Each structure stands twice: as structure tokens, then as C-alpha cells.
Amino acid sequence: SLDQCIVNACKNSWDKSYLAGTPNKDNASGFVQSVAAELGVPMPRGNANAMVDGLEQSWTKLASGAEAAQKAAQGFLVIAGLKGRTYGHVAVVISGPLYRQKYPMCWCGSIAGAVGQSQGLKSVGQVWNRTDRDRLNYYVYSLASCSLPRAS
């Protein structure tokens, strides 16, 4: 679908290290920074809490996880994010079926390891704890990053 460029950027960014020596799979903010860089989307600098702070200040916030999945399906970069006392978390929302009819699928790395990692096969409602997953913010960029289908 129209989110193919976002999925491709996620796949490409998985193996990169936005901060030298730190695999993006082990760094939520770094993973998102690499995805945005590939897509040509400007991003606030810093760790996950800093990124959420910047997005809160500058990006449109969507109303729900369903809407997040819809915008991703239109070729928009959508970031799910939530600040933490110690560490925040950020993830790229992709098109796909909603877990428990609520929570969209995502890609993300994490300092926490496997529980915080997703290669498109965990939903935000499994990456985040039950006490967090209904408190997420979904931020959408102001234009669609993906392109027209191949002309030929």
C-alpha cells in the first residue's frame, strides 16, 4: 500500500546506528531518527522524551490509534509516543489490523530489549503496558512522505 515507503524506511533503519555504536534496535529514539532521516522529515533532536516534547509542540495530534493506522495507510509518517519518568518511548505506526480493535501495528527499537522492539509484528498495545497504551499520543507529519505508485 501507500505506506510501503515507511515500511521500507523502518526495515532499513532497523540495522543502522543513528548514534555511533548503538544499534537502532536498542534505541527507540535513534530508530525513529533514522526513519525520519530516510524520509526527509525533520525531527526534534534528542532521546525519546525530548522527541515527544518536540512533537507535542510542533505536530498535529491524531484522535485515536485507528486514525493513526489510517494516516499511515495514506503514506504519512505517524509516531506513537509517550514520555516516561526515566525513559520515554517512540514508535513508527504502520498500516495493519488493530490489536484488540484499538492498537495499531508498529516498528520500534528499545533500550529495554525484546519487550520494546517491534519489526512490524507487535502492536503499540503490546509494546506498551496496559497502564500506558491508552495514554499514547499519535503525531502525524504535515505532508505525506511516500510517493505515487511506480509509473511503469
From Swiss-Prot:
Keywords: Disulfide bond, Host membrane, Hydrolase, Membrane, Secreted. Coiled coil: none annotated. Disulfide bonds join 5-146. Its EC number is 3.4.19.11. GO terms for molecular function: amidase activity. One of its GO terms (cellular component) is membrane. It is found in: Host membrane; Secreted. The keyword Isomerase does not apply. Transmembrane segments: none annotated. The active site is at 28 (nucleophile), 89 (proton acceptor). It catalyses: Hydrolysis of gamma-D-glutamyl bonds to the L-terminus (position 7) of meso-diaminopimelic acid (meso-A2pm) in 7-(L-Ala-gamma-D-Glu)-meso-A2pm and 7-(L-Ala-gamma-D-Glu)-7-(D-Ala)-meso-A2pm. It is required that the D-terminal amino and carboxy groups of meso-A2pm are unsubstituted. Forms a heterotetramer with Tsi1 consisting of two Tse1 dimers and two Tsi1 dimers. Formation of the complex inactivates Tse1 enzymatic activity. Toxin secreted by the H1 type VI (H1-T6SS) secretion system into the periplasm of recipient cells. Degrades peptidoglycan via amidase activity thereby helping itself to compete with other bacteria. To protect itself, the bacterium synthesizes immunity protein Tsi1 that specifically interacts with and inactivates cognate toxin. This is Peptidoglycan amidase Tse1. It comes from Pseudomonas aeruginosa (strain ATCC 15692 / DSM 22644 / CIP 104116 / JCM 14847 / LMG 12228 / 1C / PRS 101 / PAO1).
